[PDB]
A paper describes a structure:
The use of cyanuric acid hydrolase to solve this societal problem is being explored and the best candidate for this biotechnological application is the thermostable enzyme from Moorella thermoacetica. Consistent with the “Toblerone fold” observed for these enzymes, the RMCAH monomer is composed of three concatenated, highly divergent, but structurally homologous domains, which endows the enzyme monomer an internal pseudo-three-fold symmetry (Domains 1, 2). As observed for AtzD and ACAH, the active site of RMCAH lies on the pseudo-three-fold axis within each monomer and is formed by similar sets of residues from all three domains. As observed for ACAH and AtzD, each of the three serine γO atoms is in close proximity to a lysine residue (Lys40, Lys161 and Lys299), generating three pairs of Ser-Lys dyads each from one of the three isostructural domains from the same monomer.
To further probe functional importance of the domain 2 flexibility, we generated a double-mutant enzyme ‘RMCAH-CC’ (G53C/E235C) in which Gly53 and Glu253 from domain 1 and 2, respectively, have been changed to Cys. We confirmed that these two cysteines introduced near the domain1/2 interface can form a disulfide bond, by determining a crystal structure of RMCAH with several additional mutations C46S/C162A/C218V/G53C/E235C. This structure showed the domain 2 locked in a partially open conformation via the disulfide linkage. Notably, RMCAH-CC showed higher activity in the presence of 10 mM DTT than in the absence of DTT. This was in contrast to wild-type RMCAH that was slightly inhibited by the high concentration of DTT possibly due to an adduct formation involving cysteine residues near the active site.
Residue numbers in the entry:
A (entry chain F): 1 to 232, 239 to 283, 289 to 368
B (entry chain A): 1 to 283, 289 to 370
C (entry chain E): 1 to 283, 289 to 369
D (entry chain H): 1 to 283, 289 to 368
The structure:
Amino acid sequence: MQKVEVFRIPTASPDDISGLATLIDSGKINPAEIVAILGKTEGNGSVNDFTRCFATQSLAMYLAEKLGISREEVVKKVAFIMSGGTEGVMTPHITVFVRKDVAAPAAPGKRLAVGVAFTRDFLPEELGRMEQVNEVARAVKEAMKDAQIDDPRDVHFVQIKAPLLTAERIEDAKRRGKDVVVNDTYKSMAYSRGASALGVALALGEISADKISNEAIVHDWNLYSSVASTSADEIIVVGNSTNSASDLVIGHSVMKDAIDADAVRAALKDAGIRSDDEMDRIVNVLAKAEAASSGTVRGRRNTMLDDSDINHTRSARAVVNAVIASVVGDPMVYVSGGAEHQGPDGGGPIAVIARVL
Amino acid sequence: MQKVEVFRIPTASPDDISGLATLIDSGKINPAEIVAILGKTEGNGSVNDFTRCFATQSLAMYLAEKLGISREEVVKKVAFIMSGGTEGVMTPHITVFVRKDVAAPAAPGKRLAVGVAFTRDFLPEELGRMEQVNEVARAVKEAMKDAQIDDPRDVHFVQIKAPLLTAERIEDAKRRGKDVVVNDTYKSMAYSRGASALGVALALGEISADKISNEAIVHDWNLYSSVASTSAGVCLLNDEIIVVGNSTNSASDLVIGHSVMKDAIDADAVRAALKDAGIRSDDEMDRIVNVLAKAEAASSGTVRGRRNTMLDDSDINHTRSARAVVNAVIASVVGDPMVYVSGGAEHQGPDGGGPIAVIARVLEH
Amino acid sequence: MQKVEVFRIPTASPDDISGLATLIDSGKINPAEIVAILGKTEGNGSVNDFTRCFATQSLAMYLAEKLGISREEVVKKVAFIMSGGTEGVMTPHITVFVRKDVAAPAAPGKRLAVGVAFTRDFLPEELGRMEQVNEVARAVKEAMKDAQIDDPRDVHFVQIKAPLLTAERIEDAKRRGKDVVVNDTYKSMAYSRGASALGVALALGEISADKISNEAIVHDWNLYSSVASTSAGVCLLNDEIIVVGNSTNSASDLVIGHSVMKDAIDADAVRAALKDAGIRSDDEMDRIVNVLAKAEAASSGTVRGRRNTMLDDSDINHTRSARAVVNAVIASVVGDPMVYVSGGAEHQGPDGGGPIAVIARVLE
Amino acid sequence: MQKVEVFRIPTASPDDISGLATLIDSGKINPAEIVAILGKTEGNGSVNDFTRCFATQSLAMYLAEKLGISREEVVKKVAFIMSGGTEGVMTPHITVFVRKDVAAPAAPGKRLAVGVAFTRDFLPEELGRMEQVNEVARAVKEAMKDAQIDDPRDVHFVQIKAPLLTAERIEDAKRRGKDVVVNDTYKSMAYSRGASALGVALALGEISADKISNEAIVHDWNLYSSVASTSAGVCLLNDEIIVVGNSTNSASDLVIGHSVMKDAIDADAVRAALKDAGIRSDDEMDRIVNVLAKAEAASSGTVRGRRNTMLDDSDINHTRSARAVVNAVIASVVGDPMVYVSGGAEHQGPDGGGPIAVIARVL
């Protein structure tokens, strides 16, 4: 029987392993049972943001030394998804997911479950195109099976690490007689995120296949997933299963715009938190944020897209973090920017992991 | 009988007067009755933010031409308080305060009232010191009289335009054998804002005189006003005071209420301020005319014990982040990001928090 | 006979008219003879940069009050070109161009001449396309005629004010069944600047017409003008053209020369432009009136084979870095950071470079 | 006999060790003979810039694995000086200093020499104060002895990696009843850099001791060293001193020279430093190994009487602008933007200026 444990650990810097080291050294976490670490690191969240890699390197070194294995093996075994940008009051932190096989009965109802799956490698001319959608969908279905979750309504978060294009890979594509979707590495990141999210939506039945095409993969924003969170294949499916002995559950909603506190409260209620006085049972909140293309919120203009000093994803992260912190009373929550085909234009999925009663 | 009207006007740019012109040309506003305009302008919100002066120059030009007087007279007649910095989802806009003398009875209970007062000019060596505190207090009392407000519990917003130090005034002080509080223009802005807010607190009985001293004017963050909102700028000669509250002798269809944000994410204080302005449920939100609030990064570097990078971030200044944060919180409470959030809250609410006021239409009056 | 005078005036702020007012009050400048003012103003040089408009509004007010005419007429009569962004050591300032008709013979040789011309209004669907190229070329030719300059080799600066797209203009174009070059206001600025610069190059014979097409207007960076300096408009909807060069029929005590910076550190091009304006050694620098240059980040991400981060830096926009760099280079050559450098150089010099001109006093 | 070799290596990212690995694998550098690595890394150069420690961590890992020793020993054996911030056209890169003991005759005249010294640990209450000045001076003299340099006029670069205050050390000082020079870690970096540079100036005889006091240590900017280059950092302890100069008892194929930039656009001082390093015409530029320079915003807010906004820009830190400017000036003089420019020059050149040194090949 599977038991999932989730640890929200404050960090002092991208390389701070002290909270994790404390949890391993106290016996609460067997490092061999760690399956994923999702971080908010305090760099600028830009292309040339190496704090994500600094955090990943430091955690892999620490765990490799604790486990007696190489850094390469740790990075092959554990997903490392580092979301840069800690604007506003957002608190840098890591959320560590541990999965144990325990022989004990479940508890009343359904409880937290996690599954992992990988896709095949993509050719450069396949990024941002239907091949990526379909391979991601397949891997998502496999991850649901791994989690022993059969109902897509019980899937609450699909975390993806997706590839990107470099100049060298574009030259490879050109040499082989192929054209890439866009001759721009940064924009290629947007195309990879969007294709991956549409693949998630396809796998879960949130959109129908006849509505998805290559031309739609950066154009039709009416197509989006309510659970996808993609970052630039490795797949983590998080949901609830009847065959789980986890003392936790996950629920979610979708923010319609950057100030949609109602969606935050709906996600809280869906995770079993039914009043403000139960807030302390939250383990973590995970959300996507973005600037709406219209340049407005509820008909009100803002400068996010005109401001040459602060990039728009930084502002959106700060804003949505402030909103969530104001709902839940805690700014140490995960907010990630760039939500192509992830929730509506200007909004994004939001999930809550909470302890049961 | 006094009637105060307040108009919140979206702007397309710092120099956009079209919404105000529309209200004047349709007859809803007599420009001669405008007493103050309080703006959020979309520059970077710092010292070298010229969008504020741009907005003020454009409005003074427009109103001077509408009134048939000089810009100098318009600026002498109308308060122009421009808060730069529209970070996050905060929507650039202006709030126009109009005070009319109308022949109609006062409304039942207390209703929106505004009063005006000016201080004497200050010598450079007096800014940030007890002389400014005391002069601000006196002027606030005069402004309460102008507003027909006798009870300090009925004061809900005290807007101040305060001075700052320049190099020439510091040299003047030195030449006269005197020292100034700081040889730093930006810190002088902080000292002027803080002394003015403490003067408000003194005038309203929020703190006792025996607890206030020069050494306290920047060091003891336990001394603060819950209604003061202070702003430093160009003019810099006399403190200008606008008192906003409620009076029994007012025929306004509006009221003001307030609370204090305990921290940058204190949505509860937003709800308390809304209820104090007569909005008792989410379904009455549409009666809001405007929200006016102070925001800041806490000196501790934390919010409710959680670290953030606001004070270490060399890309985004901490007051920019704080404005974005508190504006976002308020917007999430009221469903509208077009509210006024102003930075730099020395002695205005607690360290890391700030006053929050709501001007709202009354119900069934 | 035409005489052009040029005054470089330090500013303390965007709305600072005090230096110009002082020059007017001393009798050195007749405001009725002012034809253009080109400023470097200290905002961030972006979309939401209102220091440019603040400077123009303040100057138009001042001149309206000095001349006894309305601001609308002043803005109709005098070119106001405010380039935001004063990064690095670059000093905010304005350069005022005055053109008088004086009764005096033709100074020996050729001397500074300036001409002005306006185009028709453009439809939103015309920006970034060949119609804009062709109209800009026409206007450059008209401005050359106004300046009494017949040789395109004698054009040393072509300053343009160009339109941009807003959401309303895009919707207007759409309603009539037309598509615009890009549904993006900032990129529309790039397309308008580039088409205008290619129109200048076309008018001056720097590139040949069959090689210019709509698809070429932002894709083929081998097409550029060596004297064009173009800037999207703040609030007007058209192109305004100032041609600055030298004419045999000029009595000016100044000349203009130019070169092209090949990259952001091409100090040699600075010295070549100086020599072309008659400054042949460091000891003649004091005859400089102003230096005018375009700057940009090269698309390659390198300078002389050396990588830089200008295009990856999410904190500092790349045009900001290029202005800081090229101004610093020029300042280090001439010993003065108070020179005009404007960013966004589509079809203005090579990829990663830009035109650079020097106006200097003669010695006769 | 001492031989110093210096290698300027382009980097693709903070963690890029490939160029160094190539130089080791080809036999040009024996890593056991590496004494220092000086980097320009492409982060923002601020407080929350972790690209510097990322570079140090990556190099220490690589060298530890190549040398068969622990990371701690690698960091004990090799100086790691990482200057973040590659603004303008400045190119990320590393400069590797290798010191060999070779049995070869003394080069004619003076040639490149390097010496190393460490100070004792400092108590928190000592940073930014005369005790730091004096200990730096002691270590500088020891490094000169190590370099076989007796004449301070032959010292052309004194690189110091000097400490800072942290919250834990301030709390330690508080527990023991002591106050620190400033209760601010970021400002503490400025005080430590300035005290260290004044210690350099003291050791080399560039300023007299009677002119130095605590009140002068962040106030009297007329007291400065023309060769000191000092740098503070969280990543690793900061008790390291490198003296670089020329000695008659050296068998190297390089020399070092220097000047002082009077302001951020002082190209004349660049040319003077090149000539001082043996580069006498533009056609000999190719003998440059590297240029190392300090840049800063002048307190006046002007350069040669012309105003700028560097100190007013709340979006771009003023040191970022100064690095971009000075890198552009040097690149325009030498024709190459891959040169070392580091920000924060307290007591390093005049207010608004900074030292500039050139390491160049002989002919």
